């Protein structure tokens, strides 16, 4: 006795009119059975000639009873049904959930078939039970409830539940109820009796709305499997992931493997797949067998060891601080872990080596910080205070002079090397004393032949011919050599627009090996003053 | 009654995702929403309504009271045209203007029933433990373009009485705002404004600008006792860029002084030929380029460059290099360690002026990353409206150039 939701077709399309797949007397007789039952449960209704629509029904036998079941292919109807608002695609994250005295899962199983269908739309869900090898008219029906597999069902079922629960929720604020699929997750801080009692009350409530609830056999018990996690109301634990030991590894095996590993990389500290990834180089087929190198076999062994460690975790307590600590795990990689109380982590994780075109550490730290911040706001609706491996002075000096706006929330320094710092700093003004290198590189973009060189105020000069180069490259190489052949302090002038970029950005990493080199040289100099001048 | 509003031919309603919000924020929005629902202004809605518009909470200055704000930017763009008021050019020539949020009156008017679905918005739950709290508007929504429009008749109506009582003052309505400009001195001004509010309060309603002070500022070239190889070098690059605006600018003579591979720090003696060339340039620069007029049928643009030390620069224009106005912005007391804040503050300040001058919002080119902006801009926003924006990479020269803008001798002496 629940209010139907108004459902419409697309844009003015038409209900599906796909023909009924031919089945056997056997498959038919089964569907005939199940459908008479459904007919009586009130879920479906026998119709007649007044309906041009149709969806193919199928007959499959599952494992649980090997008993003949049924399936209706709504694909077409779905592609013809109007759009609804996105169903919950953002699921809760264990680190964000709060600890409870108890938690119970109730199974509103075929509740899909409990909610009434918008009487109008019903004709579109019509299907047909075939006759023995296409004899006269097979049996015709239509759904009167939310069909398993139908597009609207999910969002609808969810809403329906939401109204029905509004009352109960309002009555007992101190009771939290999570909806997911056909599962209700109710937890509390009440005494188990009170709790179990309330569970019952809630159940009964459902019962009022025709919502049939569990049989002790199907009853799920804690902990709970929430994708990679085992959750006990007291705390969570990461499911023990297994790496199979074999003597034959296909590319698939290596990819899938690398995958699983990667996932663990977020939780378990120490994971590495470098040598594994290496095995993928030049692969010709998925079913291809690639023998593991010694190094491959090695890291695989080290990993098995780490993975046999029990990673246990803590839930969110709104009365305590949210803290986030980061580590620069090599260049371009960052590790973080959020805990309220030392060593008791809610969530941890690391962000991959973002191979970009050109940046620096501080920027990278920043981007990690933001990624984290965002996650936090979704998880706890609060940003964590930050503990960063960079001096506040480094921060101040970099940010206050960078061309692009950036910011790091309330943070604090924690000396946990390696610390991030500025690899160099181009001079503010030209250096008095130091030599000057008027550099220049020119290449024919079509013959890809070029030359690069310099002339200094001191007399030094040089040129280098290059084959299979580009003008950009030359200009840079000019600068490269300039740094190479210069002492600790260098004044270099150039008309390369890109160098102007380097003056403004002062990146300490780039997609270009060449640039990188220059950076290395830069970092090496005691002082460097870049000056740009218009070309020609 | 309700006037039949529609969507532009072939347009569908927005379906914009709700960005995650802060707890503080979600609490206030809920509070707010329940109230409005009770007041009948908004209703909870079903899943058969697939549209959506982002929402968020901002701070009503001087109060702890959080103000609800919706991002109608998409809806506005999808809403049919009503073929607003013509911009009173006189406004910009007023000694002091003040703004007022008159968006509150909209609730009073009902929204065409057939349009309400398109007003669909959502309240998110932390860790998405709860589904979103869906609602739709039953009345005139704030920040939507159609509102000030439908509300025009009534608006003008209630207004006249004051306008005639004080015809020396100009009133302009943009979205939920009202900007009042007069030539009265501060006190007599604000007293008269409050007199206006009282007037507005007997129905149900509720910044200190100074447009005439908005000086058009020039580019000042460096002057030195002696000039070095580098000094000149920088100078030449700047003017060479500068030539795209004033083609009369010339660096030939100077470029001859740059003949020779010498020490950057070495001093070069200026030839009279080069020296004249410089004065000729100073003369050109002394004034804004000719032939620049605002096109009402063209998108207004605003670019900004981070100058550092809390300083920034902007250029509103419609055609590259053809600037309608240029200016600078210094960070407001308190924003010392926050870039985003200073930025949002500026975007707002610029936008206000843009409205004040041409009666529309520019489209921003922001020297900031998308992710940085999106994650923290709302935290410091204060305007009822939200301008359009794009994120860019600042060309080093453009920055270098405008960094040359002239500043006061001492400043605006606030004795
Ligand atoms: C107990 C509780 C909530 C919670 O914050 N913690 C919490 C703690 C432990 C569990 Cl197992 C769950 C739970 O419902 O499992 C999810 C992961 C499927 C929730 S919100 C919904 C109601 O129940």
Mutate to test the interface with B, among A407, A408, A497 (most CBs of B within 10 A): A407
Mutate to test the interface with A, among B10, B29, B53, B127 (most CBs of A within 10 A): B127
Ligand 1 geometric centre to CA of B127 (Å): 11
A7 CB near ligand 1 (under 6 Å)? no
Interface residue B153 vs chain A (CB under 8 A): no
How far is Cα B205 from Cα B151, in angstroms, rounded to an integer? Answer: 14
Asked if A82 and B50 come within 8 Å (Cβ–Cβ), the reply is yes
Chain A CB contacts of B129 under 8 Å are: 92, 96-97, 176, 178
Residue pair A443/A474 in contact (Cβ under 8 Å)? The answer is yes
On whether A183 is known to bind a ligand per the annotation, the reply is yes
SS3 A359: strand
CATH no., domain A317-423? 3.30.70.270
| CATH architecture entry for B213-294 | 2-Layer Sandwich (3.30)
A313 CB near ligand 1 (under 6 Å)? no
Closest chain A C-alpha to B144 CA, distance in angstroms: 22
Candidate from B20, B261, B372 with C-beta closest to A407: B372
* Structure tokens that stand for A534 in this block: 């218009």
How far is Cα A420 from Cα B54, in angstroms, rounded to an integer? Answer: 37
On whether A495 is known to bind a ligand per the annotation, the reply is yes
Domain at B295-401, CATH homologous superfamily: Reverse transcriptase/Diguanylate cyclase domain (3.30.70.270)
Interface residue B376 vs chain A (CB under 8 A): yes
CA distances from B184 to B92, B167, B414 (A): 15, 12, 19
* Structure tokens that stand for A173 in this block: 């604020």
Show the 3-state SS of A168-181: HHHHCCCEEEEEEC
Would you mind telling me the total number of residues written for chain A in this entry? 536
Class of the domain covering A88-112+154-222: alpha beta
SS3 A465: strand
B 233-272: CB under 8 A from A: 233-234, 236-237, 240-241, 258, 261-266
Closest chain A C-alpha to B91 CA, distance in angstroms: 33
SS3 A127: strand
End-to-end CA distance of chain B: 55
Asked if B46 and A7 come within 8 Å (Cβ–Cβ), the reply is no
If you ran DSSP here, which 8-state letter would residue A232 be given? E
Interhelix angle B152-165/B186-201, rounded to 10 degrees, is: 140
Q: Is residue B187 packed enough to be buried (19+ CB in 10 Å), middle (13-18) or exposed (0-12)?
A: exposed
Domain A424-535 adopts which CATH fold? Nucleotidyltransferase; domain 5 (3.30.420)
Asked if A534 and B237 come within 8 Å (Cβ–Cβ), the reply is yes
Mutate to test the interface with A, among B121, B264, B367, B398 (most CBs of A within 10 A): B264
Asked if A97 and B50 come within 8 Å (Cβ–Cβ), the reply is no
Asked if B233 and A531 come within 8 Å (Cβ–Cβ), the reply is yes
* Structure tokens that stand for A208 in this block: 């009022």
Asked if B52 and A83 come within 8 Å (Cβ–Cβ), the reply is no
Asked if B237 and A93 come within 8 Å (Cβ–Cβ), the reply is no
Q: Is residue A316 packed enough to be buried (19+ CB in 10 Å), middle (13-18) or exposed (0-12)?
A: buried
Q: What angle do CA B305, B234, B336 make, to 5 degrees?
A: 35
DSSP element (H, E) containing A509: strand A509-510
Closest chain B C-alpha to A174 CA, distance in angstroms: 15
Q: What angle do CA A339, A345, A349 make, to 5 degrees?
A: 100
A97 CB near ligand 1 (under 6 Å)? yes
Identify the bridge partners of residue A127 per DSSP, sorted by sequence position: A55, A141
Chain B CB contacts of A405 under 8 Å are: 306, 339-340, 342-343, 366-369, 372
* Structure tokens that stand for A494 in this block: 């150039």
Asked if B233 and A493 come within 8 Å (Cβ–Cβ), the reply is yes
Identify the bridge partners of residue A188 per DSSP, sorted by sequence position: A102, A175
Show the 3-state SS of chain B: CCCCCCECCCCCCCECCCCCCCHHHHHHHHHHHHHHHHCCCEEECCCCCCCEECEEEEECCCCCCEEEEECCHHHHHHECCCCCCCCCHHHHHCCEEEEEECHHHHHHCECCCCCHHHHCEEECCHHHCCCCEEEEECECCCCCCHHHHHCHHHHHHHHHHHHHHCCCCEEEEECCEEEEEECCCHHHHHHHHHHHHHHHHCCCCCCEECHHHCCCCCECCCCCCCEEHHHHHHHHHHHHHHCCCCCCCCCHHHHHHCCCCCCCCCEECCCHHHHHHHHHHHHHHCCCCCCCCCCCCCCCEEEEEEEECCEEEEEEEEECCEEEEEEEEECCCCCCCCHHHHHHHHHHHHHHHHHHHHCCCCEEEECECHHHHHHHCHHHCCCCCCCEEEECCCCHHHHHHHCCECCCCCCCCCC
Structural domain boundaries in chain A = 1-87+113-153, 88-112+154-222, 223-316, 317-423, 424-535
How far is Cα A378 from Cα A366, in angstroms, rounded to an integer? Answer: 19
Ligand 1 geometric centre to CA of A283 (Å): 44
DSSP element (H, E) containing A197: helix A192-208
CA distances from A71 to A37, A39, B99 (A): 15, 15, 64
- Asked if the domains at B90-114+156-212 and B295-401 fall in one CATH topology, the answer is yes
On whether A14 is known to bind a ligand per the annotation, the reply is no
A202 CB near ligand 1 (under 6 Å)? no
CA distances from B350 to B181, B314, B359 (A): 18, 8, 12
Burial B4-37 (b: 16+ CB within 10 A, else e): ebeeeeeeebbebebbbbbeebbebbeebbeebe
Interface residue B160 vs chain A (CB under 8 A): no
Structural domain boundaries in chain B = 1-89+115-155, 90-114+156-212, 213-294, 295-401
Distance from the Cα of residue A407 to its chain's centroid? 24
Q: Which residue's entry shows tokens 């409870």?
A: A100
Identify the bridge partners of residue A289 per DSSP, sorted by sequence position: A250
Chain A CB contacts of B119 under 8 Å are: none
A224 CB near ligand 1 (under 6 Å)? yes
Number of A:B CB contacts under 8 A? 163
The chain B residue lying nearest A459, using CA atoms, is B261
Closest chain B C-alpha to A274 CA, distance in angstroms: 30
Q: What residue owns the CA closest to ligand 1's atom 13?
A: A185
Chain A CB contacts of B236 under 8 Å are: 533-534
**Cα–Cα nearest to A61, from A37, A36, A35, A26:** A26
Helices (H) and strands (E) in chain A, counts: 12, 24
The side-by-side arrangement of strands in the sheet containing B121-123 is B42-44, B133-137, B121-123
A187 CB near ligand 1 (under 6 Å)? yes
Neighbouring C-beta atoms of residue B79, cutoff 10 Å: 21
| φ and ψ at residue B389, rounded to 5 degrees | -150, 160
DSSP element (H, E) containing A328: strand A323-328
Residue pair B51/B72 in contact (Cβ under 8 Å)? The answer is no
Candidate from A404, A431, A457 with C-beta closest to B369: A404
* Structure tokens that stand for A63 in this block: 């494992």
Q: What residue owns the CA closest to ligand 1's atom 9?
A: A233
Neighbouring C-beta atoms of residue B283, cutoff 10 Å: 11
Chain A CB contacts of B25 under 8 Å are: 381
The reply to whether omega before A312 is within 30° of 0 (cis) is: no
Asked if A85 and B126 come within 8 Å (Cβ–Cβ), the reply is no
Q: Which residue's entry shows tokens 């470098």?
A: A274
Interface residue B22 vs chain A (CB under 8 A): yes
Class of the domain covering B90-114+156-212: alpha beta
Burial A90-99 (b: 16+ CB within 10 A, else e): eebbbbbbeb
Domain A223-316 adopts which CATH fold? Alpha-Beta Plaits (3.30.70)
Closest chain A C-alpha to B335 CA, distance in angstroms: 11
Residue pair B207/B120 in contact (Cβ under 8 Å)? The answer is no
B 311-350: CB under 8 A from A: 337-340, 342-343
Q: What residue owns the CA closest to ligand 1's atom 2?
A: A187
Mutate to test the interface with A, among B396, B397, B399 (most CBs of A within 10 A): B396
Asked if A7 and B394 come within 8 Å (Cβ–Cβ), the reply is no
Concatenated DSSP letters of A510-535: ES-HHHHHHHHHHHHSSEEEEEE---
On whether B212 is known to bind a ligand per the annotation, the reply is no
Residue pair B69/B28 in contact (Cβ under 8 Å)? The answer is no
Asked if B369 and A382 come within 8 Å (Cβ–Cβ), the reply is no
Residue pair B388/B203 in contact (Cβ under 8 Å)? The answer is no
Interface residue B10 vs chain A (CB under 8 A): no
Identify the experimental approach. Answer: X-ray
Domain at A1-87+113-153, CATH homologous superfamily: HIV Type 1 Reverse Transcriptase, subunit A, domain 1 (3.10.10.10)
Interface residue B117 vs chain A (CB under 8 A): no
Residue pair B401/B219 in contact (Cβ under 8 Å)? The answer is yes
A80 CB near ligand 1 (under 6 Å)? no
* Structure tokens that stand for A121 in this block: 């739309």
Does CATH number 3.30.1520.10 belong to domain B1-89+115-155? no
On whether A475 is known to bind a ligand per the annotation, the reply is yes
């Amino acid at each position: 006795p629940i209010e139907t939701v108004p459902v419409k077709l697309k844009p003015g399309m038409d209900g599906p009119k796909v023909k009924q797949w031919p089945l056997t007397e056997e498959k038919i007789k089964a569907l005939v059975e199940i459908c008479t039952e459904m007919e009586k449960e009130g879920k479906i209704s026998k119709i007649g000639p007044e309906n041009p629509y149709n969806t193919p029904v199928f007959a499959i036998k599952k494992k649980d009873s090997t008993k003949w079941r049924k399936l209706v292919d709504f694909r077409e109807l779905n592609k013809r049904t109007q759009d609804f608002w996105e169903v919950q695609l953002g699921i809760p994250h264990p680190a964000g959930l709060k600890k409870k005295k108890s938690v119970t899962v109730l199974d509103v199983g075929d509740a899909y078939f409990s909610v009434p269908l918008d009487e109008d739309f019903r004709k579109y869900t019509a299907f047909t039970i075939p006759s023995i090898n296409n004899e006269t008219p097979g049996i015709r029906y239509q759904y009167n409830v939310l069909p398993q597999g139908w597009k609207g069902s999910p969002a609808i079922f969810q809403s329906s539940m939401t109204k029905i629960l509004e009352p109960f929720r309002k009555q007992n604020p101190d009771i939290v109820i999570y909806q997911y699929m056909d599962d209700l997750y109710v937890g509390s801080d009440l005494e188990i009796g009170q709790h179990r009692t309330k569970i019952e009350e809630l159940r009964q409530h459902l019962l009022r709305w025709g919502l049939t609830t569990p049989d002790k056999k199907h009853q799920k018990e804690p902990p709970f499997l929430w994708m990679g996690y085992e959750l006990h109301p007291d705390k969570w634990t990461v499911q023990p992931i297994v790496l199979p030991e074999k003597d034959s590894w296909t590319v698939n095996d290596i990819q899938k493997l690398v995958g699983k590993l990667n996932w663990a990389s977020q939780i378990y500290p120490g994971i590495k797949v470098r040598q594994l990834c290496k095995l993928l180089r030049g692969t010709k087929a998925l079913t291809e067998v690639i023998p593991l190198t010694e190094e491959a076999e090695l890291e695989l062994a080290e990993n098995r060891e780490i993975l046999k460690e029990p990673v246990h975790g803590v839930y969110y307590d709104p009365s305590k601080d949210l803290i986030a600590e980061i580590q620069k795990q090599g260049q371009g990689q960052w590790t973080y872990q959020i805990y309220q109380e030392p060593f008791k982590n809610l969530k941890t994780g690391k962000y991959a080596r973002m191979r970009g075109a050109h940046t620096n550490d501080v920027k990278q730290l920043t981007e990690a910080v933001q990624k984290i911040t965002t996650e936090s706001i979704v998880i706890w609706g609060k940003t964590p205070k930050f503990k960063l491996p960079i001096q506040k002075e480094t921060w101040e000096t970099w940010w206050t002079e960078y061309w692009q706006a950036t910011w790091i929330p309330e943070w604090e320094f924690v000396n946990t090397p390696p610390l991030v710092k500025l690899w160099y700093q181009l001079e503010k003004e030209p250096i008095v004393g130091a030599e000057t290198f008027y550099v220049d590189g020119a290449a024919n973009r079509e013959t890809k032949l070029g030359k690069a060189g310099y002339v200094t105020n001191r007399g030094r000069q040089k040129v280098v011919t290059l084959t299979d180069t580009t003008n950009q490259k030359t200009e840079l190489q000019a600068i490269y050599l300039a740094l190479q052949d210069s002492g600790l302090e260098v004044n270099i002038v150039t008309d390369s627009q890109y160098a102007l970029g380097i003056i403004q950005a002062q990146p300490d990493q780039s997609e270009s090996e060449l640039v990188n080199q220059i950076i290395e040289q830069l970092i090496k100099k005691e002082k460097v003053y870049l000056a740009w001048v218009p070309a020609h | 009654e309700t006037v039949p509003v529609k969507l532009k031919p072939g347009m569908d309603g927005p379906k914009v995702k709700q960005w995650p919000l802060t707890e503080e924020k979600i609490k206030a929005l809920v509070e707010i929403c329940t109230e409005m629902e009770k007041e009948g202004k908004i209703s909870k809605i079903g899943p058969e309504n697939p549209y959506n518009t982002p929402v968020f909470a901002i701070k009503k200055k001087d109060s702890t009271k959080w103000r609800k704000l919706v991002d109608f930017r998409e809806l506005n763009k999808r809403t049919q045209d009503f073929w607003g008021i013509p911009h009173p050019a006189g406004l910009k020539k007023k000694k002091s203007v003040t703004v007022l949020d008159v968006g509150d009156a909209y609730f009073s008017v009902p929204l065409d029933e057939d349009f309400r679905k398109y007003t669909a918005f959502t309240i998110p739950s932390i860790n998405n433990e709860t589904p979103g709290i869906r609602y739709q508007y039953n009345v005139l929504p704030q920040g939507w373009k159609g509102s000030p429009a439908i509300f025009q008749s009534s608006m003008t109506k209630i207004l006249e009485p004051f306008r005639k009582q004080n015809p020396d003052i100009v009133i302009y309505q943009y979205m939920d705002d009202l900007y009042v400009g007069s030539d009265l001195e501060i006190g007599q001004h604000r007293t008269k404004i409050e007199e206006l509010r009282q007037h507005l309060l007997r129905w149900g309603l509720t910044y200190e600008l100074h447009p005439d002070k908005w000086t058009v500022q020039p580019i000042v070239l460096p002057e030195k006792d002696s000039w070095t190889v580098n000094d000149i070098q920088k100078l030449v690059g700047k003017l060479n860029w500068a030539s795209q605006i004033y083609p009369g600018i010339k660096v030939r003579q100077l470029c001859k002084l740059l003949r020779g591979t010498k020490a950057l720090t070495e001093v070069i003696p200026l030839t009279e030929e080069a020296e004249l060339e410089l004065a000729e340039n100073r003369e050109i620069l002394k004034e804004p380029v000719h032939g620049v007029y605002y096109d009402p049928s063209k998108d207004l643009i605003a670019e900004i460059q981070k100058q550092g030390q809390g300083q920034w620069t902007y250029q509103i224009y419609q055609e590259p290099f053809k600037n309608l106005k240029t200016g600078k912005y210094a960070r407001m007391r308190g924003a010392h360690t926050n870039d985003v804040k200073q930025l949002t503050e500026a975007v707002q300040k610029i936008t206000t002026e843009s409205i004040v001058i041409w009666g529309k919002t520019p489209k921003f080119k922001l020297p900031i990353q998308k992710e940085t902006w999106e994650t923290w801009w709302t935290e410091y926003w204060q305007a009822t409206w939200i301008p359009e924006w794009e994120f860019v990479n600042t060309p080093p020269l453009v920055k270098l150039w405008y960094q040359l803008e002239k500043e006061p001798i001492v400043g605006a002496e606030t004795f």
